[PDB]
Amino acid sequence: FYFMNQLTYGFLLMITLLILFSQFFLPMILRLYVSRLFISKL
């Protein structure tokens, strides 16, 4: 029945979270990594 429905909105939100977490949520914590490392190393 809703094979197209679930599949298409799942594809959209999968590629959405791909680009979203990639561009946003991994480097927003990698900034914390590099910041704490650069303060500790001076």
């Binding site: 704490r36 303060i39 500790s40 001076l42």
Partner: protein, 52 residues
């Protein structure tokens, strides 16, 4: 029929507030104090290096 699983959920979350919440509280407090202590100590150390 479905509110009984809700009752198990409420009792389980009560046990979570009894058991899991102070443990994660203490883990977060310990890591917080550790990172804050190291971050203060490195700064004080190279302040003393500036004084040297």
């Amino acid at each position: 029929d479905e509110s009984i699983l809700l009752l198990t959920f409420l009792g389980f979350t009560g046990l979570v507030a009894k058991y899991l919440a102070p443990a994660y509280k203490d883990f977060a407090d310990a890591r917080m104090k550790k990172v804050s202590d190291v971050l203060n100590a490195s700064r004080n150390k190279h302040v003393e290096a500036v004084k040297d």
